[PDB]
Design a protein around this ligand. Structure first.
Ligand SMILES: Nc1nc2c(ncn2[C@@H]2O[C@H](COP(=O)(O)OP(=O)(O)OP(=O)(O)O)[C@@H](O)[C@H]2O)c(=O)[nH]1
Ligand SMILES: Nc1nc2c(ncn2[C@@H]2O[C@H](COP(=O)(O)OP(=O)(O)O)[C@@H](O)[C@H]2O)c(=O)[nH]1
Ligand SMILES: Nc1nc2c(ncn2[C@@H]2O[C@H](COP(=O)(O)OP(=O)(O)O)[C@@H](O)[C@H]2O)c(=O)[nH]1
Ligand SMILES: [Mg+2]
Lengths: 48, 427, 430, 48, 427
């Protein structure tokens, strides 16, 4: 019953890899967003 | 990790160093009183490179400041970060500069050098993992042009192994301020060629030109000019202070960018630069930085590389970024303009990545390069120095200090040989 | 019972080593604090009380990156004695790292490996990693291998080095260090594999879905190949493969040891869910030139050595069928004097993936290590690049002042020329 | 006391400055001696 | 992927280009501050064609603005969407327009061209697959007429493969507003014929006729006048930006419409147009659009196609509609009026359908045609130029800038040859 290896393999980490990568995106795009905000703060100070 | 001693000479050197220490203190997050007040643990990992420690929770830079007249030293101490410097480090005489190279070299130079040597040796032996010394001076006036070379000769004599990296303010060939300036630059070059391992040239014309081309500052002063110079100051040593994906110290740059011992004069460039209005519009990518770095307008040297050719180049990038993106940009920029690079040196470019970016900027990069366009800069002064030397008017001010005429003859012959050597490597 | 000692030099070695030992801890099930929540003896040592220590030695002339490991999460796992750092780097100079600087730290490192060698009763060989373009990787590595040759005699010194890329270069003095190191290990190295960053850059983009790669991804892919190479001796299988078995088969002569490597299947995390991945599919994907991590086209040359290693749900019947099908490919050429040229091994343990990684779990996988005359493409390219420099003496003054005698430069050039001629002679037919 | 003493200049000599620096040093010595005298934990005095 | 670079020259070009950017900004849904606030996700599918990305979710158009006077740059900055354009891209001179072709081409053209080329080169590298360059300029005065030819020649030298398309305004036969237009137009024709692959000609008089006939504008202005031209530019590029049943880019159009290299001057038209009180009665359908498109009153060039013969033409439709209905309408119009078309080129009219229609309109269409009716426009300027140049001393104004009188004769000889080529291919 090799399929036991097939199914016990496929399920756990690959599906979790999807959610982990999906979570990684959710961190990243607001990570840059707050990098942008602190840059905008650095405009207003340096402008002054 | 590897400590460096910083040396400043002249009115130009002290003010530039003052802004340089402001930038370093800001990036490490050191309070003006000398107490660390930062926000990240990475700042204290390797802060011993430029700072010492006192038994009061305080830090003191390894800075040695030299002048002939005490006016500049009091101005430096009066600054916002004046207290940060050790009181004894201020070494100064009670005589004016005189604007004469010979007067500073022989009369005042021999008097001051003995005391400065002891002060430097105190800082030199205060730490064991020693890298080479750093010098900032100007070649126009008397104190910087003469004393800086005399100290450089002593530094080479005592510590042959260490790297003597120097930064020089080349006399602005069309904007400079001193009548006898061609004499000072002519004489100082001879000492600088044989002693200094690394020489970087900065022209005030370029600083004003870059400021009005890119930054669009309404009322520029030396403070803004010193800040732009300080950016290259901090970017050069960045790999030493902070981690990176490919480390590169000064010795790495010297080995890669110097094909022959007398070819070490370099031109430096910085990116990104933006007017205080326009930065809403930029994308902050490696191609964006590459476009600014390789552009001739951003070069703080009054020479156009397109008139000459490259034979060595290097760039240091600061930030968390791709190795592959830097590899692609350098490969494309090398292949796209192949006419400007000599054939007998494949891969004329060098790369290095440091992980920690400067304050406020997610991406930053510094370009140090070499080209045969240096032949123009020294030709300008050589042609003028010939005009003075033909009529021999102002020589009497240099003879009165005991300087022989052969010093002029040997100096100009040295520059002429240097220009010829750069001419041969055109082919 | 059986042990392998790992040695890492240069910045490349330590981050590759960091990527490797990260996988082994997850693969053997070792927590970062050294305790557990088997094959441990091969790669870890037990000191009682349930604590494990790796049999690894990291050496560098810079103190920078080694300190970063000392401050990393895995700091408690590694012994301070194992991690050795220097005072000042070689600055991409082979002269500086070989005579002037490297000769200071050579004795201390030799003492450490000998000390660690005592605990390994079943020691069968060493694994060594290099940075060819770096001064420390080449300058110190040549001295280390020269000493290791006489210190232990008949011990398998296996190497996995980063050869310069055909086009992408980060050092202007890269050709000099590469050839001088090439002259060095050609006499001492038992078997050294070659990989280049440019091929790994393309593979991680064309096959794997990471739009904007970094060095970290390259290290993980390298670690997977190393793990599968040594996985035969760690777990049960129908056909175990020992290091001596590779040494006997993969080389037909002493000087023709240099293999090329392949790995399959590399695939994105979701592309595997929509594919079959049978034995034939993974086997046929290996032979494609796009999967070679050395940027040389195998169609130019010929094959005279191969070794299959299987880590997956694999039955020997399919392996024979896959090999037979590959044998009928007329796009693949075999030399007349090597009729079989294959050895395959079967190991049941599937490859282990990393959380937050890039590789999809692959329920059955296969590794390739082959020797071909196509490697002569890389040797010639470095030769013309060197001749472009040395004809006008571009950077000679740095090396001479740091201990290099100029007579060594033609010696390395002549040695490379002899090796190229030797490769061509073997490639000829009678 | 010490902060003002830090706000002094080099190479300067004037009876006004020299008096200020001299009195600055003497005042500092007096205050330090007073501190050292009062540094003891036990003080027996007869207040006036 | 198929990006497009836009260039605006002179007074007329900048005002039309501003309206051009205003319409497209509304179409994609870009708020005047530069941040997306649209409603449909299809708008961001291919915004890279015309828009660049700035950090912070701000989009900046690939716009290059050139003029010799700063007053025009004052107007665009003060406009509603002035803040959207990149401030560095605003390149301008510090001298008057001069109302002269030679003055713009030689005196100030050489000074400005280098800076313009560098600025354009910046945007040229910010696009993977830049399809071609787009120019909007007028042939009347000499600022756009003179400098635009120099820029177009330089761009062709740099980018031979890219499709260069220009939108030019010709001097009106009756509402001409300069004593010396015929000289400027005649000189510009020589460069226009050899450089640009596709040329679209629009005349002001036909625009006034269209507005007064259909739109019923009591007091039409340039803003109302430029709206129709903005629609025509928007319709042409709609295939690249949005899906359609039959995509048709510019290079498809050039192959179909151009039988021979020199015959590339085209006439454009737009439908539907309706007075603001007459829209209730119109039951707009595909045949109704076809009737408007091929009607001679809706043509924006003051040349009746009926007097001449038709070469190959193409029509682009926007919206949802039956392919059979569209295909049947062209076959009907092609066969009904066979006298208008040349017999030796069957299938004269080309089709193309895009799925997404413009705002407010359930569907719309655009017409582009090639015909020999252009000979009337060249005849008008030739007759005027002949009576101009007979008084050969009036050339002295162009002589001051270095224009030799033999240039006028050579330009007219080339322009006459173009007329003759149009005459031969009539039969
Ligand atoms: N693929 C990959 N290559 C690396 C990595 N780190 C370093 N390298 C390689 O190492 C080369 C640079 O040399 P170093 O890593 O500094 O090694 P080194 O011998 O210590 O060099 P020196 O500092 O001059 O002594 C680069 O060209 C890379 O090819 C890595 O993390 N991944
Ligand atoms: N960029 C910059 N230049 C300076 C500054 N201070 C002085 N300079 C210039 O540098 C030159 C200094 O001359 P210098 O050789 O130091 O005079 P010396 O005292 O006789 O040695 C002058 O010509 C100044 O124009 C500064 O703070 N920043
Ligand atoms: N349709 C239209 N025509 C304009 C506009 N602005 C100027 N023009 C016309 O352009 C013609 C010439 O303009 P000019 O300033 O000489 O442009 P130049 O050729 O670049 O110098 C004039 O006859 C104007 O009527 C506008 O906004 N719309
Ligand atoms: Mg290294």
């Amino acid at each position: 019953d090799e399929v036991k290896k097939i199914n016990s393999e496929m399920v756990a980490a690959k599906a979790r890899t999807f959610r982990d990568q999906q979570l990684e995106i959710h961190r990243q795009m607001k990570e840059d967003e707050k990098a942008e905000e602190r840059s905008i703060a650095d405009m207003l100070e340096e402008n002054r | 990790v590897r400590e460096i001693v910083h040396i400043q000479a002249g009115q130009c050197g002290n003010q530039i160093g003052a802004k340089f220490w402001e930038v370093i203190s800001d990036e490490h997050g050191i309070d003006p009183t000398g107490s660390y007040h930062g926000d990240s643990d990475l700042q204290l990992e390797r802060i011993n490179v430029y700072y010492n420690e006192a038994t009061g929770g305080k830090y003191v830079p390894r800075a040695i400041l030299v002048d002939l007249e005490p006016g500049t030293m009091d101005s430096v101490r009066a600054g916002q970060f004046g207290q940060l410097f050790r009181p004894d480090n201020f070494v100064f005489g009670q005589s004016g500069a005189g604007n004469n190279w010979a007067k500073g070299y022989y009369t005042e130079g021999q008097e001051l050098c003995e005391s400065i040597l002891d002060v430097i040796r105190k800082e030199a032996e205060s730490c064991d993992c020693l890298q080479g010394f750093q010098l900032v001076h100007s070649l126009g006036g008397g104190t910087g042009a003469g004393l800086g070379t005399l100290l450089l000769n002593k530094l080479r004599e005592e510590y042959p192994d260490r790297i003597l990296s120097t930064y020089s303010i080349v006399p602005s060939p069309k904007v400079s301020d001193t009548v006898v300036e061609p004499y000072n630059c002519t004489l100082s070059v001879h000492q600088l060629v044989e002693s200094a391992d690394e020489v970087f040239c900065i022209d005030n014309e370029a600083l004003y030109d870059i400021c009005f081309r890119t930054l669009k500052l309404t009322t520029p002063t030396y403070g803004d000019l010193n800040h732009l110079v300080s950016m290259v100051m901090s970017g050069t040593t960045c790999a030493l202070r902070f981690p990176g994906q490919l480390n590169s110290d000064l010795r790495k740059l010297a080995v890669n960018l110097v094909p022959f011992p007398r070819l070490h004069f370099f031109i430096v460039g910085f990116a990104p630069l933006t007017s205080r209005g326009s930065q809403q519009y930029r994308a902050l990518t490696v191609p964006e930085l590459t476009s600014q770095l390789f552009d001739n307008k951003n070069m703080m040297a009054a020479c156009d590389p397109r008139r000459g050719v490259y034979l060595t180049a290097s760039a240091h990038f600061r930030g968390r970024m791709s190795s592959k993106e830097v590899d692609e940009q350098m490969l494309n920029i090398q292949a796209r303009n192949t006419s400007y690079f000599v054939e007998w040196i494949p891969s004329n470019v060098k790369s290095a990545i440091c992980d920690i970016p400067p304050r406020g900027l997610k991406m930053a990069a510094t370009f140090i390069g070499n080209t045969t366009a240096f032949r123009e800069l020294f030709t300008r002064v050589d042609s003028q120095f010939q005009k003075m030397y033909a009529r021999r008017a102002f020589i009497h001010w240099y003879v009165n200090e005991g300087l022989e005429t052969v010093e002029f003859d040997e100096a100009r012959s040295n520059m002429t040989d240097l220009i010829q050597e750069y001419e041969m490597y055109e082919t | 019972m059986r042990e392998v000692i790992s040695i890492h030099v240069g910045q490349a070695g330590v981050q590759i080593g960091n990527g490797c030992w990260e996988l082994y801890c997850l693969e053997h099930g070792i927590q970062p604090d050294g305790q557990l929540p088997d094959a441990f003896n091969t790669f870890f040592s037990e000191t009682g009380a349930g604590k494990h220590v790796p049999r690894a030695v990291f050496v560098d002339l810079e103190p920078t990156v080694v300190d970063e490991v000392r401050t990393g999460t895995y700091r408690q796992l590694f012994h301070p004695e194992q991690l050795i750092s220097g005072k000042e780097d070689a600055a991409n100079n082979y002269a500086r790292g070989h005579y002037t600087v490297g000769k200071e730290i050579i004795d201390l490192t030799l003492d450490r490996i000998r000390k660690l060698a005592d605990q390994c009763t079943g020691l069968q060989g060493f694994l060594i990693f290099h940075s060819f373009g770096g001064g420390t990787g080449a300058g110190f590595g040549s001295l280390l291998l020269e000493r290791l040759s006489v210190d232990y005699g008949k011990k398998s010194k296996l190497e996995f080095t980063v050869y310069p890329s055909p086009q992408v270069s980060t050092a202007i003095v890269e050709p000099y260090n590469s050839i001088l190191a090439t002259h060095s290990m050609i006499d001492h190295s038992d078997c050294a594999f070659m990989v280049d960053n440019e091929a790994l850059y393309d593979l991680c983009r064309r096959a794997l879905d990471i739009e904007r790669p970094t060095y970290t991804n390259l290290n993980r892919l390298i670690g997977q190949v190393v793990s599968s190479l040594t996985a035969s001796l760690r777990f049960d299988g129908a056909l175990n493969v020992d290091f001596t078995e590779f040494q006997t088969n993969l080389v037909p002569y002493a000087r023709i040891h240099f293999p090329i490597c392949s790995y399959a299947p590399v695939i994105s995390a979701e592309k595997a869910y929509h594919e079959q991945l049978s034995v034939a599919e993974i086997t046929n994907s290996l032979f494609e030139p796009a999967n070679m991590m050395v940027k040389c086209d195998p169609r130019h040359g010929k094959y005279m050595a191969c070794t299959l290693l299987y880590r997956g749900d694999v039955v020997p019947k399919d392996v024979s069928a896959a090999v037979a099908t590959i044998k009928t490919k007329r796009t693949i050429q075999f030399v007349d004097w090597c009729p079989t040229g294959f050895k395959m091994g079967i190991n049941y343990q599937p490859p282990t993936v990393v959380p937050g990684g890039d590789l999809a779990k692959v329920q059955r996988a296969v590794c390739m290590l082959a020797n071909t005359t196509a490697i002569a493409e890389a040797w010639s390219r470095l030769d013309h690049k060197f001749d472009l420099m040395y004809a006008k003496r571009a950077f000679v003054h740095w090396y001479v002042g740091e201990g290099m005698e100029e007579a060594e430069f033609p010696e390395a050039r002549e040695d490379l020329a002899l090796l190229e001629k030797d490769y061509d002679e073997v490639a000829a037919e009678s | 006391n010490k902060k003002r003493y830090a706000s002094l200049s080099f190479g300067q000599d004037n009876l006004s400055f020299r008096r200020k620096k001299e009195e600055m040093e003497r005042e500092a010595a007096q205050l330090e001696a007073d501190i050292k005298t009062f540094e003891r934990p036990n003080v027996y005095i007869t207040e006036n």
